[PDB]
């Protein structure tokens, strides 16, 4: 067994960067707040440090889908208890079923009960909820609205065991696109929320009245009046739409429901907000703008009630992409509303809010000259979760596709003032890291991220001012620096429907955009010669890989390389480039103009990660494989002429190098992999002869390791990319 060494793991500070489909306040305990994410686990707010604490970093390599958090419930009767429904996809992309996780210590530790079906924390419909709900009068009882047509599920033993509720017989019939050939939009979204009437029981006794939301346009709302023994469609309900939210107020005895014509979170063209009064059975359409009006171009979600003053409620657009989201507020139970912005004289608007992003300045997306009617930063989008603090009428929080915004002066709206919104995402690190580099001079690390581009990180403790611009990719798929002239850098990535390339000669002080070769539909990957004098780019979509000798102004096709081959430059000899594709290794000795196959056997076809070593010409390490084929770590010391498998590694998925141990003759090597039957993150300081585990079972981060980098200046340091937990750095303790 590889021994473990004590390490300190932190996030490189970005603040947010991903979608928060759910914010959940505990109804009895003030400042107890959780957030659920689509791909990056769940978090608990720590009010003493003003930061979020991740709760699911123990999810590892084989159960990686558990970082998908489709619902979370926090127990009002016992605030130490918390539950989460987990799993990431309901198609083939997650090979595993979902689970309900249960905790008696606020998510410090958990136990899992696997479900007999999949959970879709990053599927369509994931902003509808909460599907998981605890009986507020009898906390042994929990319900889960399942996806897929599996219907309504229940535990009566504090989450330990779960079974289908036989008497609930509508599992839902809506998929966003039932004929999607991509097999992503075509899954039944199912039973979407469970909401109790707390006045229908008392501490210790089963709540008799329960409402359930179903993604069925003709049967959206069900009710039990006998503690879930029997269920019936609620009479007199509206039809034609899907209920994103169902929020019940026992003070006035009213169920509010926000509907949309799709499951969300990316779309929604029509919907309504309805009010059901339980005492009389009355239905009222309280839509700020009803779907019968041609002025309405979004559905509704973001439904929340002010628990301290329950005549006050809010709802929001699901979805207004243009000109921005709108939020609506009523203080008289929906009889009338005002809106957070208004047209004054088109394209100008008046606003009931201001926004301060000085703690997360990249949220303007590098745009400080937006064209009216747009502003920058925007109010938001994918704003399915909007929540008034049940202990403080002045606090509200909402999730977007990029952040959590919060206000602490919400009732200023009601006196004609402007609420202040600010990000509230310190510690909540949700980005997918696609590539990462650590040069030997200047800033310690550069990130290449999905959705927000990525950054030069001048200080790992300080949020970068802006993502890369000119060009500004949505996702940077690959970045490189010229080993011998590190201020020269290149990056490729995704831009409005296609791809492109950005180059720089002052280490990203400023970039400019190069021209494209034919057929580019996405960034793919790129390599920069060691002296900065050539670029080899394998774009997505293109039929070829291309060379530039003009720093991206012009290109020429490379005849031998398959489309999309993984390219790496030698870090010493500017004339050497390498490529890997599907079991074949290829080398160029003429600075990228041509390549030739050198190895066609012994390398697993699945391997797609390799790297040349700084300071060591022709020294290459290669990681990959699969459990059905062959798997491990290979090394060449002859510029790719041949590879030797390391006997010390059972499986490896990526490899990088950093500063040598004092006295050692070779850089430290870091891998993502399996060594002596243990999965994790390993360091070798003797050329791969033996390994030390530098992570631990609480710090596994799921499907991590697509991008890793050692640090040539700092012994022991590893920049560890994740898919949903940002960019970590680990240091020897
Ligand atoms: Br829109
Ligand atoms: K819309």
XYZ file of C-alpha atoms and ligand atoms in Angstrom:
735
model
C 0.000 0.000 0.000
C 1.156 3.555 -0.797
C 1.436 5.483 2.493
C -0.462 8.803 2.864
C 1.202 12.152 3.557
C -0.647 14.985 5.252
C -1.840 17.539 2.715
C -3.770 20.801 2.799
C -6.344 21.158 0.013
C -8.002 24.477 -0.837
C -9.940 25.921 -3.798
C -8.157 28.447 -5.952
C -10.567 31.386 -5.320
C -13.097 32.014 -8.095
C -16.470 32.260 -6.225
C -19.305 30.296 -7.813
C -19.196 29.841 -11.597
C -21.995 27.286 -11.897
C -25.724 26.660 -11.607
C -27.380 26.551 -8.158
C -30.802 25.056 -8.794
C -31.793 25.067 -5.137
C -31.304 27.130 -2.001
C -32.942 25.705 1.111
C -33.414 27.561 4.425
C -34.204 25.590 7.650
C -37.638 26.688 8.828
C -36.779 26.736 12.589
C -33.084 27.620 12.806
C -31.883 30.987 11.749
C -28.724 31.190 9.485
C -29.003 27.470 8.665
C -28.981 27.400 4.847
C -28.022 24.669 2.304
C -27.405 24.885 -1.462
C -27.744 22.007 -3.899
C -25.805 21.978 -7.236
C -26.226 20.202 -10.522
C -22.721 18.759 -10.795
C -20.802 19.910 -7.668
C -22.423 18.383 -4.605
C -24.078 20.308 -1.784
C -23.030 22.959 0.701
C -23.990 24.268 4.124
C -23.604 27.961 4.910
C -21.191 28.891 7.675
C -22.284 32.239 9.051
C -19.178 32.581 11.270
C -16.804 32.588 8.226
C -19.349 33.925 5.670
C -18.705 31.006 3.455
C -20.097 27.801 2.118
C -18.865 24.383 3.240
C -18.907 21.545 0.776
C -20.558 18.390 2.097
C -20.067 15.765 -0.588
C -16.269 15.813 -1.356
C -16.076 12.204 -0.190
C -17.973 11.153 -3.364
C -15.276 9.483 -5.434
C -14.324 7.778 -8.641
C -16.900 5.006 -8.881
C -19.982 6.802 -7.405
C -19.114 10.200 -9.145
C -22.754 10.753 -10.114
C -23.543 11.421 -6.476
C -22.225 14.976 -6.952
C -25.530 15.567 -8.693
C -27.915 16.874 -6.061
C -31.499 16.795 -7.338
C -33.140 17.679 -4.008
C -32.242 18.481 -0.400
C -34.388 18.679 2.784
C -33.335 20.099 6.100
C -35.279 18.953 9.130
C -37.184 21.799 10.950
C -38.004 19.445 13.951
C -34.362 18.509 14.334
C -32.026 20.883 12.540
C -29.118 18.423 12.821
C -30.827 16.208 10.244
C -30.400 16.649 6.482
C -31.186 14.508 3.452
C -30.237 14.667 -0.248
C -31.363 12.909 -3.366
C -28.335 12.316 -5.497
C -27.264 11.062 -8.892
C -26.362 13.040 -12.071
C -27.983 11.683 -15.223
C -30.929 9.473 -16.089
C -29.444 8.534 -19.416
C -26.353 6.413 -20.113
C -23.916 9.111 -18.996
C -24.254 8.068 -15.358
C -23.900 4.278 -15.203
C -25.178 4.293 -11.553
C -28.632 4.575 -9.895
C -29.365 7.422 -7.557
C -29.526 7.345 -3.736
C -30.975 9.140 -0.775
C -28.263 10.334 1.556
C -29.071 10.916 5.243
C -27.136 12.771 7.935
C -27.638 13.459 11.654
C -24.829 16.069 11.783
C -25.697 18.720 9.109
C -23.890 16.837 6.365
C -20.571 16.312 8.144
C -21.106 12.578 7.648
C -23.733 10.612 5.700
C -25.173 7.189 5.021
C -26.593 6.205 1.645
C -29.631 4.182 0.565
C -29.407 3.458 -3.181
C -32.614 3.783 -5.158
C -33.725 1.395 -7.804
C -33.663 4.032 -10.522
C -31.636 6.956 -11.690
C -31.599 10.502 -10.317
C -31.023 13.436 -12.723
C -29.204 16.202 -10.868
C -27.879 17.532 -14.166
C -30.883 16.663 -16.317
C -33.689 18.805 -17.687
C -36.175 19.606 -15.005
C -33.605 19.851 -12.192
C -34.762 23.297 -11.069
C -38.185 22.051 -10.214
C -38.555 21.097 -6.581
C -37.995 20.280 -3.853
C -38.847 16.637 -4.639
C -37.674 15.581 -1.180
C -39.786 16.659 1.786
C -39.916 15.784 5.473
C -43.217 15.705 7.399
C -42.973 18.755 9.622
C -45.019 17.160 12.419
C -43.562 13.661 12.217
C -39.968 13.669 11.095
C -39.659 9.930 10.524
C -41.669 10.425 7.355
C -39.988 11.621 4.208
C -41.226 11.698 0.609
C -39.369 11.766 -2.662
C -40.896 12.649 -6.017
C -39.065 10.401 -8.464
C -38.171 10.887 -12.154
C -38.841 8.432 -14.920
C -42.458 7.505 -14.154
C -41.373 5.755 -10.929
C -43.877 7.931 -9.078
C -43.841 8.903 -5.409
C -41.513 7.196 -2.951
C -41.518 7.293 0.816
C -39.540 6.431 3.915
C -41.121 6.051 7.344
C -37.790 5.424 9.171
C -35.900 8.705 8.877
C -34.623 8.018 5.377
C -33.059 4.579 6.030
C -35.326 2.547 3.768
C -37.523 3.676 0.860
C -40.446 2.172 -1.037
C -42.854 3.145 -3.749
C -46.226 4.635 -2.578
C -48.557 2.142 -4.312
C -51.593 4.368 -4.006
C -49.978 7.317 -5.965
C -50.541 6.314 -9.476
C -49.412 9.190 -11.726
C -45.705 9.205 -12.385
C -45.820 12.006 -14.942
C -45.808 11.956 -18.737
C -43.735 14.955 -19.817
C -40.260 14.799 -21.326
C -38.886 17.973 -22.893
C -38.350 16.223 -26.264
C -39.438 12.533 -26.282
C -37.700 11.965 -29.657
C -34.335 13.591 -28.867
C -31.764 11.575 -30.813
C -29.065 12.801 -28.369
C -30.863 10.922 -25.566
C -30.640 13.940 -23.168
C -34.029 15.793 -23.428
C -36.183 12.691 -23.662
C -36.427 11.553 -19.980
C -39.685 11.650 -17.981
C -39.269 14.401 -15.433
C -41.815 12.835 -13.087
C -43.117 13.852 -9.692
C -41.550 17.238 -9.062
C -42.337 18.462 -5.547
C -43.929 17.466 -2.262
C -45.473 20.042 0.008
C -47.064 19.528 3.431
C -49.872 21.448 5.206
C -48.354 21.727 8.711
C -51.608 22.630 10.316
C -52.840 19.092 9.337
C -50.991 17.407 12.151
C -49.137 18.219 15.391
C -45.754 17.258 16.802
C -45.575 13.398 16.753
C -48.623 12.769 14.484
C -48.619 12.215 10.745
C -49.573 15.332 8.761
C -52.897 14.416 7.090
C -52.829 16.922 4.164
C -50.105 16.698 1.528
C -49.858 18.306 -1.935
C -47.767 16.853 -4.710
C -46.660 18.422 -8.027
C -46.421 16.234 -11.170
C -44.971 17.086 -14.569
C -48.278 16.313 -16.316
C -50.042 19.216 -18.003
C -53.476 17.688 -17.393
C -52.864 16.460 -13.761
C -50.352 18.797 -12.261
C -51.497 18.739 -8.637
C -52.404 15.833 -6.367
C -53.487 15.845 -2.763
C -53.866 13.395 0.098
C -56.177 14.302 3.007
C -55.515 11.024 4.918
C -51.749 11.158 5.644
C -50.771 9.670 2.262
C -52.953 6.598 2.369
C -54.847 7.747 -0.688
C -54.270 10.367 -3.379
C -56.442 12.256 -5.823
C -56.004 14.956 -8.432
C -56.925 18.304 -6.894
C -60.390 19.336 -8.297
C -60.768 22.590 -10.173
C -57.044 22.944 -10.889
C -55.843 24.670 -14.093
C -54.413 22.625 -17.017
C -51.816 23.107 -19.738
C -48.689 23.679 -17.721
C -46.066 22.116 -15.416
C -45.750 23.099 -11.731
C -42.213 24.228 -10.975
C -43.049 25.109 -7.381
C -45.712 24.564 -4.790
C -45.437 26.644 -1.633
C -48.060 26.273 1.199
C -48.925 28.911 3.776
C -50.788 27.556 6.775
C -51.284 31.055 8.198
C -53.786 31.876 5.452
C -54.352 28.253 4.389
C -53.268 28.774 0.788
C -51.230 26.815 -1.775
C -49.333 28.971 -4.308
C -48.111 27.213 -7.490
C -45.790 28.653 -10.199
C -46.218 26.978 -13.582
C -44.345 26.926 -16.874
C -44.807 25.248 -20.284
C -41.471 23.410 -19.970
C -39.503 21.710 -17.176
C -36.675 24.195 -17.331
C -34.105 25.318 -16.473
C -33.025 26.799 -19.870
C -36.434 27.561 -21.391
C -40.060 28.477 -20.579
C -42.265 30.676 -22.831
C -45.641 30.724 -20.928
C -47.061 29.925 -17.510
C -49.240 31.217 -14.645
C -49.159 31.666 -10.877
C -52.254 30.238 -9.152
C -53.601 30.468 -5.582
C -55.670 27.652 -4.091
C -57.542 28.440 -0.879
C -57.979 25.186 1.026
C -60.883 26.209 3.297
C -63.196 27.018 0.381
C -61.560 25.092 -2.460
C -61.229 28.358 -4.408
C -58.806 28.805 -7.363
C -57.530 32.241 -8.384
C -55.088 33.152 -11.177
C -52.749 35.625 -9.463
C -50.232 35.828 -12.374
C -48.417 39.119 -12.477
C -48.974 38.602 -16.275
C -51.283 35.675 -17.162
C -50.555 33.262 -19.984
C -53.750 34.507 -21.691
C -51.824 37.732 -22.326
C -49.635 37.939 -25.428
C -47.327 40.159 -23.288
C -46.200 37.048 -21.368
C -43.140 35.363 -22.885
C -41.895 33.307 -19.942
C -43.299 30.863 -17.428
C -42.887 31.188 -13.691
C -40.675 29.784 -11.013
C -38.688 31.306 -8.134
C -41.741 31.114 -5.950
C -41.201 32.015 -2.353
C -43.287 33.186 0.607
C -42.083 35.491 3.399
C -42.675 33.268 6.493
C -42.484 36.200 8.932
C -45.066 38.150 6.840
C -46.921 35.596 4.732
C -49.019 37.999 2.762
C -45.705 38.810 1.035
C -44.604 36.563 -1.834
C -42.348 36.664 -4.820
C -42.049 34.877 -8.144
C -39.736 35.169 -11.147
C -39.411 34.565 -14.895
C -38.687 31.083 -16.041
C -37.166 32.117 -18.410
C -36.543 35.666 -19.553
C -33.175 35.778 -21.222
C -34.010 39.201 -22.641
C -33.614 41.877 -21.575
C -32.919 40.153 -18.248
C -34.805 38.141 -15.596
C -37.803 39.790 -13.907
C -38.844 39.285 -10.311
C -42.254 40.183 -9.012
C -43.328 40.972 -5.435
C -46.745 41.058 -3.840
C -47.539 42.139 -0.255
C -51.262 41.278 -0.346
C -51.389 37.584 -1.138
C -51.165 38.090 -4.895
C -53.969 40.623 -5.329
C -51.415 42.994 -6.925
C -47.722 42.966 -7.810
C -44.830 45.227 -8.614
C -41.744 44.280 -10.600
C -38.050 44.716 -9.969
C -37.566 46.733 -13.180
C -39.905 48.597 -15.540
C -39.659 50.023 -18.992
C -39.751 53.832 -18.744
C -39.180 54.729 -22.427
C -37.873 51.791 -24.387
C -34.994 50.856 -24.337
C -34.489 52.509 -20.906
C -35.637 50.963 -17.667
C -36.158 51.963 -14.045
C -34.891 49.556 -11.423
C -35.885 48.526 -7.893
C -32.382 47.091 -7.357
C -28.694 47.848 -7.634
C -25.917 45.240 -7.891
C -22.445 45.295 -6.324
C -20.071 42.617 -7.734
C -16.834 44.117 -6.525
C -16.125 40.831 -4.607
C -16.695 38.760 -7.793
C -15.812 41.204 -10.575
C -15.767 38.736 -13.430
C -19.583 38.534 -13.219
C -19.734 41.370 -15.808
C -18.215 38.792 -18.204
C -15.569 41.436 -19.221
C -18.359 43.647 -20.618
C -18.577 47.132 -19.077
C -20.273 48.736 -22.160
C -23.494 46.775 -22.585
C -25.965 47.867 -25.237
C -29.365 48.970 -23.919
C -31.680 47.427 -22.908
C -29.057 45.015 -21.448
C -26.973 45.878 -18.382
C -23.832 44.148 -17.082
C -23.727 42.343 -14.756
C -27.224 41.061 -15.337
C -29.866 40.354 -12.736
C -29.722 36.737 -13.703
C -31.038 33.808 -15.597
C -31.968 30.164 -14.774
C -33.414 31.728 -11.616
C -35.524 28.740 -10.546
C -34.594 29.110 -6.906
C -35.521 32.437 -5.301
C -35.924 32.236 -1.514
C -36.958 34.712 1.234
C -35.211 33.903 4.562
C -37.976 32.512 6.816
C -36.237 34.236 9.795
C -35.592 37.578 8.129
C -37.970 39.315 5.700
C -35.112 41.507 4.585
C -32.955 38.625 3.271
C -33.386 36.912 -0.033
C -31.122 34.604 -2.009
C -31.354 33.315 -5.549
C -29.444 31.001 -7.775
C -28.452 31.721 -11.386
C -26.538 29.672 -13.922
C -23.337 31.373 -12.597
C -23.803 32.496 -8.995
C -25.964 33.107 -5.870
C -27.042 36.712 -5.380
C -28.337 37.922 -2.067
C -29.939 41.005 -0.552
C -30.114 42.069 3.029
C -32.529 45.001 2.543
C -35.375 43.327 0.676
C -38.194 45.320 2.284
C -36.666 48.534 0.903
C -38.669 47.489 -2.200
C -41.871 48.118 -0.271
C -41.013 51.703 0.612
C -40.056 52.552 -3.030
C -36.269 52.038 -2.516
C -33.731 49.932 -4.334
C -32.649 46.623 -2.896
C -28.869 45.889 -2.912
C -27.869 42.570 -4.468
C -24.368 41.080 -4.074
C -22.880 37.680 -4.804
C -22.899 35.213 -1.882
C -20.687 32.387 -3.106
C -17.426 32.416 -1.099
C -16.506 28.675 -0.685
C -19.050 27.457 -3.249
C -16.778 26.509 -6.144
C -18.723 24.892 -8.982
C -16.563 25.215 -12.181
C -15.464 22.506 -14.496
C -11.738 22.642 -15.121
C -10.833 21.744 -18.664
C -7.121 22.550 -18.671
C -4.631 24.262 -16.412
C -0.974 25.389 -16.616
C 1.585 26.532 -14.091
C 4.460 28.510 -15.758
C 7.936 28.793 -14.148
C 7.648 32.595 -13.913
C 4.933 35.109 -13.302
C 1.482 34.073 -12.043
C 1.275 30.640 -10.330
C -1.552 29.168 -12.410
C -3.844 29.801 -15.393
C -7.205 28.049 -15.562
C -9.224 27.008 -18.500
C -12.849 26.544 -17.466
C -16.275 25.661 -18.850
C -18.942 28.504 -18.969
C -16.825 31.344 -17.579
C -13.660 31.079 -19.668
C -10.969 30.878 -17.007
C -8.383 33.169 -15.600
C -4.834 34.154 -14.913
C -4.675 33.694 -11.099
C -2.233 36.243 -9.687
C -3.053 35.251 -6.141
C -4.801 31.917 -5.307
C -6.687 33.649 -2.479
C -8.167 36.490 -4.598
C -10.973 36.326 -7.117
C -9.615 37.268 -10.584
C -10.900 40.592 -12.022
C -11.940 39.171 -15.418
C -11.846 36.045 -17.440
C -9.796 36.080 -20.599
C -10.931 38.542 -23.268
C -10.278 39.295 -26.928
C -11.238 36.591 -27.465
C -13.566 35.755 -24.581
C -14.438 32.060 -24.865
C -17.441 30.673 -23.047
C -15.324 27.599 -22.305
C -11.524 27.498 -22.768
C -10.755 23.912 -23.762
C -6.936 24.063 -23.912
C -4.148 26.443 -22.915
C -0.321 26.245 -23.355
C 2.751 28.369 -22.785
C 6.135 28.301 -24.590
C 8.323 26.561 -22.044
C 11.364 28.647 -22.962
C 9.465 31.966 -23.361
C 6.537 31.618 -20.905
C 5.000 35.007 -21.548
C 4.005 33.617 -24.942
C 0.799 31.660 -24.584
C -2.018 30.286 -26.633
C -5.548 29.088 -25.784
C -8.409 27.614 -27.726
C -12.095 27.366 -26.922
C -15.703 27.875 -27.716
C -17.211 31.127 -28.979
C -20.730 31.867 -30.157
C -21.708 28.607 -31.838
C -18.063 27.724 -32.861
C -14.410 27.842 -31.807
C -11.376 30.046 -31.847
C -7.864 30.795 -30.693
C -6.388 33.518 -28.485
C -2.680 34.338 -28.394
C -0.494 36.587 -26.253
C 3.106 37.648 -25.819
C 2.848 39.469 -22.422
C 1.516 36.491 -20.377
C -2.145 37.484 -20.859
C -1.777 41.211 -20.010
C -3.567 41.274 -23.328
C -4.591 38.700 -25.918
C -5.715 38.851 -29.585
C -7.694 36.496 -31.646
C -6.174 34.437 -34.491
C -7.896 33.331 -37.671
C -9.419 29.854 -37.936
C -8.616 26.875 -40.120
C -11.587 25.232 -41.893
C -14.340 23.350 -40.122
C -13.873 24.568 -36.514
C -16.952 23.915 -34.361
C -15.287 23.929 -30.881
C -11.908 24.604 -29.201
C -10.405 21.086 -29.192
C -6.749 21.251 -28.097
C -3.568 23.162 -28.802
C 0.227 23.068 -28.341
C 2.844 25.717 -28.487
C 6.450 25.078 -29.407
C 8.996 25.514 -26.731
C 10.358 28.733 -28.278
C 6.950 30.123 -29.159
C 7.549 29.769 -32.879
C 4.874 27.318 -33.931
C 1.369 26.359 -32.887
C -0.311 23.093 -33.577
C -4.086 23.163 -33.204
C -6.461 20.183 -33.370
C -9.839 22.009 -33.316
C -13.143 20.353 -32.716
C -15.180 19.698 -35.844
C -12.267 20.152 -38.280
C -11.202 17.205 -40.442
C -7.449 17.885 -39.766
C -4.932 19.251 -37.285
C -3.195 22.454 -38.411
C 0.137 24.175 -38.038
C 0.636 27.953 -37.756
C 4.009 29.630 -38.154
C 2.480 33.064 -38.054
C 1.243 33.038 -34.453
C -2.303 32.206 -35.508
C -2.690 34.534 -38.558
C -2.572 31.625 -41.058
C -2.736 27.829 -40.980
C -1.697 24.735 -42.990
C -3.121 21.288 -42.636
C -1.062 18.422 -41.208
C -1.668 15.384 -43.400
C -0.902 12.468 -41.079
C -2.832 13.266 -37.839
C -6.385 12.098 -37.248
C -8.959 14.845 -36.437
C -9.001 15.675 -32.769
C -5.694 14.058 -31.846
C -4.214 15.126 -28.479
C -1.228 17.387 -29.195
C 1.719 18.189 -26.900
C 4.921 20.052 -27.535
C 8.322 18.899 -26.327
C 9.291 21.241 -23.524
C 12.931 21.535 -24.580
C 13.295 21.098 -28.356
C 11.160 23.517 -30.321
C 11.240 21.222 -33.336
C 9.487 18.376 -31.550
C 5.703 17.895 -31.213
C 3.823 14.751 -30.282
C 0.320 13.439 -30.696
C -1.817 10.635 -29.389
C -4.955 9.150 -30.889
C -6.738 5.900 -30.326
C -3.734 3.660 -29.550
C -1.297 5.397 -31.940
C 1.468 7.808 -30.890
C 2.838 10.232 -33.516
C 5.924 12.444 -33.531
C 7.020 15.527 -35.510
C 10.697 16.506 -35.674
C 10.100 19.369 -38.151
C 8.317 21.798 -35.745
C 4.853 20.455 -36.553
C 4.843 20.500 -40.362
C 4.506 16.723 -40.513
C 3.962 13.854 -38.091
C 4.480 10.090 -38.329
C 3.147 7.146 -36.385
C 5.861 5.733 -34.090
C 3.850 3.368 -31.772
C 0.774 1.429 -32.714
C 0.693 -1.273 -30.002
C 0.840 -1.470 -26.197
C -0.864 1.881 -25.585
C -4.524 1.465 -24.683
C -6.879 2.836 -27.366
C -8.733 4.827 -24.666
C -5.706 6.730 -23.380
C -5.945 10.415 -24.200
C -3.637 12.085 -21.664
C 0.116 12.547 -21.930
C 2.755 15.123 -21.198
C 6.383 15.974 -21.963
C 8.581 16.928 -18.985
C 9.980 20.396 -18.631
C 13.791 20.360 -18.850
C 13.890 16.787 -20.288
C 13.882 16.537 -24.057
C 11.971 13.532 -25.366
C 10.772 12.456 -21.888
C 7.027 11.736 -22.080
C 4.566 10.119 -19.619
C 1.234 8.807 -20.793
C -1.830 7.817 -18.663
C -4.962 5.960 -19.556
C -6.935 2.924 -20.416
C -10.042 1.171 -19.248
C -10.936 -1.669 -16.839
C -12.086 -3.829 -19.814
C -8.824 -3.318 -21.745
C -5.434 -2.325 -20.285
C -4.719 0.537 -17.945
C -1.841 2.319 -16.361
C 1.063 4.744 -16.760
C 3.679 4.562 -19.498
C 6.866 6.464 -20.073
C 9.053 7.225 -23.051
C 12.598 8.589 -22.810
C 13.276 8.451 -26.522
C 10.936 11.089 -27.934
C 8.103 8.713 -28.448
C 9.973 5.897 -30.208
C 8.883 3.483 -27.478
C 7.017 3.309 -24.210
C 7.496 1.238 -21.084
C 4.636 0.513 -18.678
C 5.364 1.310 -14.990
C 4.862 -1.809 -12.828
C 4.010 0.432 -9.808
C 0.654 1.745 -11.166
C -2.522 -0.261 -11.741
C -4.468 2.527 -13.459
C -3.828 6.083 -14.367
C -5.924 8.793 -16.023
C -3.679 11.776 -16.026
C -0.109 12.800 -15.214
C 1.888 15.956 -14.538
C 5.204 17.164 -13.039
C 6.320 19.647 -10.466
C 9.310 20.772 -8.473
C 11.671 17.964 -7.424
C 12.113 16.938 -3.828
C 15.278 18.381 -2.296
C 18.072 16.026 -3.301
C 15.987 14.046 -5.850
C 17.215 14.087 -9.445
C 13.847 14.197 -11.278
C 10.702 16.364 -11.010
C 7.951 15.015 -8.764
C 5.322 13.165 -10.726
C 1.548 13.432 -9.881
C -1.098 11.129 -11.170
C -4.808 10.559 -10.946
C -5.106 6.788 -10.647
C -5.101 3.548 -8.665
C -2.018 2.304 -6.836
C -1.938 -0.885 -4.686
C -5.760 -1.152 -4.827
C -6.455 2.387 -3.685
C -8.096 5.053 -5.933
C -6.912 8.691 -5.534
C -4.186 11.200 -6.182
C -0.548 10.089 -5.966
C 2.866 11.638 -5.940
C 6.191 10.012 -6.891
C 9.533 11.727 -6.081
C 11.641 8.791 -7.400
C 10.761 8.612 -11.071
C 7.730 6.470 -10.562
C 9.423 3.703 -8.550
C 7.018 4.231 -5.605
C 4.067 6.496 -4.725
C 2.598 8.471 -1.836
C -1.199 9.187 -1.573
C -1.715 12.927 -1.251
C -5.564 13.029 -1.014
C -7.831 11.136 1.369
C -11.271 9.549 1.487
C -12.969 12.871 2.422
C -11.310 14.649 -0.522
C -11.987 12.611 -3.615
C -14.018 15.103 -5.723
C -15.819 12.672 -7.942
C -14.983 12.688 -11.709
C -11.956 14.853 -11.183
C -8.578 15.069 -12.883
C -9.350 16.048 -16.503
C -6.809 18.860 -15.996
C -3.869 18.691 -13.504
C -0.578 20.538 -13.189
C 2.344 20.432 -10.888
C 4.073 23.582 -9.953
C 7.677 23.907 -11.133
C 8.383 26.539 -8.457
C 6.782 24.878 -5.374
C 7.594 21.436 -4.074
C 4.616 19.255 -3.372
C 2.049 21.475 -4.913
C -0.623 20.088 -7.247
C -3.200 22.050 -9.164
C -6.074 19.634 -9.206
C -8.886 20.149 -11.667
C -12.393 18.928 -11.003
C -15.589 18.718 -12.995
C -17.882 20.736 -10.737
C -15.737 21.608 -7.744
C -13.405 24.220 -9.302
C -9.683 24.142 -9.277
C -8.029 22.878 -6.102
C -4.427 23.314 -4.935
C -2.907 20.805 -2.535
C 0.296 21.505 -0.538
C 2.289 19.077 1.662
C 1.363 19.987 5.276
Br -36.499 35.352 -23.519
K -38.727 32.775 -22.744
